[PDB]
Design a protein around this ligand. Structure first.
Ligand SMILES: *[C@@H]1O[C@H](CO)[C@@H](O[C@@H]2O[C@H](CO)[C@@H](O)[C@H](O)[C@H]2NC(C)=O)[C@H](O)[C@H]1NC(C)=O
Ligand SMILES: *[C@@H]1O[C@H](CO)[C@@H](O)[C@H](O)[C@H]1NC(C)=O
Ligand SMILES: *[C@@H]1O[C@H](CO)[C@@H](O)[C@H](O)[C@H]1NC(C)=O
Ligand SMILES: *[C@@H]1O[C@H](CO)[C@@H](O)[C@H](O)[C@H]1NC(C)=O
Ligand SMILES: *[C@@H]1O[C@H](CO)[C@@H](O)[C@H](O)[C@H]1NC(C)=O
Ligand SMILES: *[C@@H]1O[C@H](CO)[C@@H](O)[C@H](O)[C@H]1NC(C)=O
Ligand SMILES: *[C@@H]1O[C@H](CO)[C@@H](O)[C@H](O)[C@H]1NC(C)=O
Ligand SMILES: *[C@@H]1O[C@H](CO)[C@@H](O)[C@H](O)[C@H]1NC(C)=O
Ligand SMILES: *[C@@H]1O[C@H](CO)[C@@H](O)[C@H](O)[C@H]1NC(C)=O
Ligand SMILES: *[C@@H]1O[C@H](CO)[C@@H](O)[C@H](O)[C@H]1NC(C)=O
Ligand SMILES: *[C@@H]1O[C@H](CO)[C@@H](O)[C@H](O)[C@H]1NC(C)=O
Lengths: 368, 413, 205, 99, 50
């Protein structure tokens, strides 16, 4: 608010208009980044009063009505991340609106599976949805229904380890704390550059105007204008480069919302390690957290194997699965879980004779 | 329209200006006025010394009003050299020395820089680089006496003229001619000092005049003699320009809980900006808050639909500026509505605006979508009995305009 | 004799309140863990400035002289706790050439069981004094711990120094050197810890 | 003239810096459009919401000035009815699952 | 290595430190880029001799 400086700054023309136009593009993009991650749901889905999910317990990731109605895990995430013409603008979606979107995404996923992502939400029982997700990784769905109590206990226990990790350390949220730290350090640097002389007799602008005659004071003030204008151009260029990195991250988070939450992904390591079953979004300060649920195979045994088997001079191959032996007998099993079936004319298909296939073995094929 | 350099404006929110509160008044605070100088001892004395060997009084470590030296009826003439008569009350000095003497009324013109003749060249020589003031008054009622006052002498003879301020007291007989003095006068051997002999009947040229020259100094050392601690009343809860002990700023002053240590005077923020001060006249601590400012944004349905607009004062409370307080700032000219809709024009903090009911700009909390409790149970499934083939359009940028600049023709040409 | 100074001799660098914050400042400080010279009364150099302290119970030390010559020739500082109060004058003093206190002038001013600690420096015609007093348990040396010295006076004397001496049961002398320090201010605005940034690579970190 | 050189060179450096930052954004958009050409015109994508909303059938490219337009054809399920359901059925003391 | 220049360069304040900090961010990212690509394997698997 020095009138003498303000009239010298007019000599520099458009620079002060294009710094604001650049920062306004950054600001509008932060709301667009957020809208593209969280506003993927057409309707605000809500869970029924009773929680008949076949033994799976979502209570730590569903809303706490006593709380913004964040989940228990979203409250841990919100605890562990923590003016010279400069102003900070509010985001368009409040933290309570972001939490309604993660609640609706989660309620749609639990009550209707992948169907709410492709049309109207179609209800399905939760264990029958998990049976389809077992078929999606190439495990037969009787493996889920025969192990449903174990699979539910392993899920409930694995969700408890998330609470322990998020209660025992802050170090996991380092990506979100880093974004908070970088923007604070950039603004503190921009303010501290007002104390610099840039070659002038003083950094205080009224001090110059008190010491010096009009034509000499103008030469001293034009150094402060030069250095303070270069100080803003440096801040705005750094924010433009930093916003391009946050947009790349928000494009990735928007893709993980569609492919990991609204669907089941075939893409290896895209939705965590192991074969992807499903994932749940949780909101965090300036970001998102995905809880990725995967099937990991646990206790392998060795078997002898064959590419085909020989019967009436015909070569038989498995329709789905692989031939294996325990050392005395031959079985066919699904590939991802040991479940041995007797080899039959309808576990298998014929193609050609015994002469062509390298490593074929002789066996009876039963004909029901 | 002027911000956009256009006569047609599309639907949106545009920043057109910056709001700024301005200081309502100015305040000054310095400590309680104390240690006034005893300058009355210089001017009210019973008598002074001879002008060849003038008498010096020292003033130090105190404050004063100097305007009395010309506003008082006691002084017949006043002058200042290197200093202005008003500016004395704002200035400061390392020491003040009063050089005190008497001369006849014709002679006062000699007490000036670069003068020539008896007082300048034999008694009190003033150089061009002097800094001080000359106070002169008629003293025929004070220094004149019946039979003539001989306590005042002036030098008439010397081997060469005085250097600047050369207080040569020597009384030895000057030999103007052939007679060697041998400690006494003779034919062209003369005593170098002459009496005034002041009598009360003298005419205005031969009446005694008292003179004080305030011979100031400033050194490499700091000041010890100064003007008074000029101060105002205090102001709170309003934006003001302020000064505390010479620390100057603009802001809203308010009382605070911050407990300074007894020697501390000013408080600073983590970014080194001042955030608190002590009032020097009553040692309590004031927080400083910046004088309020923010962007001004204009909300418009576009000139193709209305000339009506709302205005947002971003981050401003409506106290500082229909009128409505959002968390984005004070919003003016928009009706608040209790319904919720899709966001038409975004304002921030969950608020949007649109043009609706016969129509006005309205402001509302944005709606995220219709709610839906899914009909879930452990044995219910929904299955689609039909389909729609849907065709959707996605648009993607692939290239910019290819541009070339000759940097030499742009800069020079 | 000599002894380790530890983390002692920090003083408040300026008249500014700061709180809950770490402040980096460059000034004349006593370098951490440097030796102080230890005494049980010669004329000593002043350099850029002095840290002075005494373990005390006898109350034998009463004052100091500072100047270029400490003599009747020219203006020099005399500082004395004159039993009732502290008294200061700037003069060419005519006292005995090895001065003691029993068991012209240009300026004037008026204000083991314990450790009494002081810092003296002269900048552009101002003479600065800082101090602290504390209880102690250790006898022979400065006790290993922390407490920042608060200003006493900022005297506009206009006069310079190169040497000093003490007037008078055991005392310690160290020299201030131009250093960068990181100072820890608590909620109540006191300095409560410090790092000498040039001491070692961890302090530099 | 050196005042004009200083300001015009800073003016032109500001333009080239923001064109470099803008070109990097357009390259990200072109790499996305090249991936949608491969995965949705040359294939049937199984990636959710990568190529329209609903289950992707196919898409068609149309050219536009400085860009591409994809017309994404999807199957949307339309008229649902609710039924009672079971994970398995029990027959001769053995459990049957839908193949 | 001129001290006369170095004392003038201090009057520009934070510019020099934030250029060094920017290039240090580039350098640390190159090791991260390399680990994200190659360190995807938990164990150093080996082929059989046959
Ligand atoms: C390989 O698998 C077969 C079938 O599971 C095993 O044969 C059975 O073995 C048990 C225990 O001896 C008997 O009670 C069954 O009657 C056997 N069934 C048949 C059809 O023979 C066989 O023992 C396994 N071999 C190995 C090496 O584990
Ligand atoms: C779900 O888990 C929480 C936390 O372990 C537990 O308090 C709650 O009782 C569980 N609910 C059911 C229905 O088992
Ligand atoms: C499988 O065979 C290898 C080689 O004989 C052996 O090291 C390993 O222990 C066996 N068992 C399993 C569970 O891999
Ligand atoms: C399998 O490989 C071994 C060598 O590792 C060889 O002796 C054997 O003949 C091979 N068998 C077949 C069916 O290829
Ligand atoms: C497999 O069966 C064929 C025909 O019965 C026979 O010729 C061949 O020797 C058998 N091979 C083995 C390894 O038993
Ligand atoms: C200043 O003077 C007033 C009136 O005598 C008195 O109330 C106030 O306490 C004084 N302040 C100080 C700091 O001495
Ligand atoms: C706005 O200012 C008034 C005082 O005029 C205050 O009572 C009110 O709480 C303020 N509101 C906000 C949101 O700052
Ligand atoms: C909104 O609700 C408040 C409180 O009931 C009422 O004063 C106001 O008139 C309402 N405005 C509209 C447009 O509904
Ligand atoms: C399916 O929808 C079409 C319109 O899209 C309608 O004409 C047709 O009768 C419907 N068929 C059934 C079985 O509902
Ligand atoms: C002390 O001050 C005098 C007068 O300013 C100066 O001539 C002298 O060189 C100074 N001595 C030192 C050691 O600074
Ligand atoms: C049957 O499904 C429809 C949605 O297709 C739902 O509105 C209805 O509530 C369900 N029936 C019951 C008894 O809830």
């Amino acid at each position: 608010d020095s009138t003498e400086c303000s009239n010298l700054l007019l000599q520099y023309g458009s620079f002060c208009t294009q710094l604001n136009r650049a920062l306004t593009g950054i600001a509008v993009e932060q709301d667009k980044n957020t809208q593209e991650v969280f506003a993927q749901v057409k309707q605000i889905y809500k869970t029924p009063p009773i929680k008949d999910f076949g033994g799976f317990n979502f209570s730590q990731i569903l809303p706490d009505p006593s709380k913004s109605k964040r989940s228990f895990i979203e409250d841990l995430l919100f605890n562990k991340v923590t003016f010279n013409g400069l102003t900070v603008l509010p985001p368009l979606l409040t933290d309570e609106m972001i939490a309604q979107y993660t609640s609706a995404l989660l309620a749609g996923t639990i009550t209707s599976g992948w169907t709410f992502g492709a049309g109207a939400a179609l209800q399905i029982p939760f264990a029958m949805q998990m049976a389809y997700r077992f078929n999606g990784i190439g495990v037969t769905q009787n493996v889920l229904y025969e192990n449903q109590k174990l699979i539910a206990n392993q899920f409930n226990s694995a969700i408890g380890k998330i609470q322990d990790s998020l209660s025992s350390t802050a170090s996991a949220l380092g990506k979100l704390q880093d974004v908070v730290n970088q923007n604070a350090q950039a603004l503190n640097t921009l303010v501290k550059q007002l104390s610099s002389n840039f070659g002038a007799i003083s950094s205080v602008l009224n001090d110059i105007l008190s010491r010096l005659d009009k034509v000499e004071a103008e030469v001293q003030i034009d150094r402060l204008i030069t250095g303070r204008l270069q100080s803003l151009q440096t801040y705005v260029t750094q924010q433009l480069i930093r916003a391009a990195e946050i947009r790349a991250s928000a494009n990735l988070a928007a893709t993980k919302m569609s492919e990991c939450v609204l669907g089941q992904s075939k893409r290896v390591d895209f939705c965590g390690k192991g074969y992807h079953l499903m994932s749940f979004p949780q909101s965090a300060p300036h970001g998102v957290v995905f809880l990725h649920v995967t099937y990991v195979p646990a206790q392998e045994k060795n078997f002898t194997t064959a590419p085909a088997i020989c019967h009436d001079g015909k070569a038989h191959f498995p329709r789905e699965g692989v031939f294996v032996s325990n050392g005395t007998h031959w079985f066919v099993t699904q590939r991802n879980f040991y479940e041995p079936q007797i080899i039959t004319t309808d576990n298998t298909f014929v193609s050609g004779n015994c002469d062509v296939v390298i490593g074929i073995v002789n066996n009876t094929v039963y004909d029901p | 329209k002027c911000t956009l350099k256009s006569f047609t404006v599309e639907k949106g929110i545009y920043q057109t200006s910056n709001f700024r509160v301005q200081p309502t008044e100015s305040i000054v605070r310095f400590p309680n006025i104390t240690n006034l100088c005893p300058f009355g001892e210089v001017f009210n004395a019973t008598r002074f010394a001879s002008v060849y060997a003038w008498n010096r009084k020292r003033i130090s470590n105190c404050v004063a009003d100097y305007s009395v030296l010309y506003n008082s009826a006691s002084f017949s003439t006043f002058k200042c050299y290197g200093v202005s008569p008003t500016k004395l009350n704002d200035l400061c000095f390392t020491n003040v020395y009063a050089d005190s003497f008497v001369i006849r009324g014709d002679e006062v013109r000699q007490i000036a820089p670069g003068q020539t003749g008896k007082i300048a060249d034999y008694n009190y020589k003033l150089p061009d680089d002097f800094t001080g003031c000359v106070i002169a008054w008629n003293s025929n009622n004070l220094d004149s006496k019946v039979g003539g006052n001989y306590n005042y002498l002036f030098r008439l003879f010397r081997k060469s003229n005085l250097k600047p301020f050369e207080r040569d007291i020597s009384t030895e007989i000057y030999q103007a001619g052939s007679t060697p003095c041998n400690g006494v006068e003779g034919f062209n051997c003369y005593f170098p000092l002459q009496s005034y002999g002041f009598q009360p009947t003298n005419g205005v040229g031969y009446q005694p005049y008292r003179v004080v020259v305030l011979s100031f100094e400033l050194l490499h050392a700091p000041a010890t003699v100064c003007g008074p601690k000029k101060s105002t009343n205090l102001v709170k809860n309003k934006c003001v320009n302020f000064n505390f002990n010479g620390l100057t700023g603009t802001g809203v002053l308010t009382e605070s809980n911050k407990k300074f240590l007894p020697f501390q005077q000013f408080g600073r923020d983590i970014a080194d900006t001042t955030d608190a001060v002590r009032d020097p006249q009553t040692l309590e601590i004031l927080d400083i808050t910046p004088c309020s400012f923010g962007g001004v944004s204009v909300i418009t349905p576009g000139t193709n639909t209305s000339n009506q607009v709302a205005v947002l004062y971003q981050g401003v409370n409506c106290t500082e500026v229909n009128v409505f307080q959002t968390r984005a700032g004070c919003l003016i000219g928009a009706e608040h509505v209790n319904n919720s809709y899709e966001c038409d024009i975004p304002i921030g903090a969950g608020i949007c605006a649109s043009y609706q009911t016969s129509q006005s700009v309205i402001a509302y909390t944005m709606s995220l979508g219709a709610e839906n409790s899914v009909a879930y149970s452990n044995n219910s499934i929904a299955i689609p009995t039909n389909f729609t083939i849907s065709v959707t359009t996605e648009i993607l940028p692939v290239s910019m305009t290819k541009t070339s600049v000759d940097c030499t023709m742009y800069i020079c040409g | 004799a000599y002894t380790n100074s530890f983390t002692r001799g920090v003083y408040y660098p300026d008249k500014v309140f700061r709180s809950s914050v770490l402040h980096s400042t460059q000034d004349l400080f006593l370098p951490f863990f440097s030796n102080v010279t230890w005494f049980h009364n010669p004329v000593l150099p002043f350099n850029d400035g002095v840290y002075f302290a005494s373990t005390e119970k006898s109350n034998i030390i009463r004052g100091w002289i500072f100047g270029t010559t400490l003599d009747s020739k020219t203006q020099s500082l005399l500082i004395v706790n004159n039993a009732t109060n502290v008294v200061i004058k700037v003069c060419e003093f005519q006292f005995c050439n090895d001065p003691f206190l029993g068991v012209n002038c240009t300026f004037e001013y008026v204000s083991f069981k314990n450790l009494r600690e002081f810092v003296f420096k002269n900048i552009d015609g101002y003479f600065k004094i800082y101090s602290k007093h504390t209880p102690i348990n250790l006898v022979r040396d400065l006790p290993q711990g922390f407490s920042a010295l608060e200003p006493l006076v900022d005297l506009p004397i206009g006069i310079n120094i190169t040497r000093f001496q003490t007037l008078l049961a055991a005392y310690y002398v160290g020299y201030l050197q131009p250093r960068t320090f990181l100072l820890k201010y608590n909620e109540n605005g006191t300095i409560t810890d410090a790092v000498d940034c040039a001491l070692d690579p961890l302090s530099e970190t």
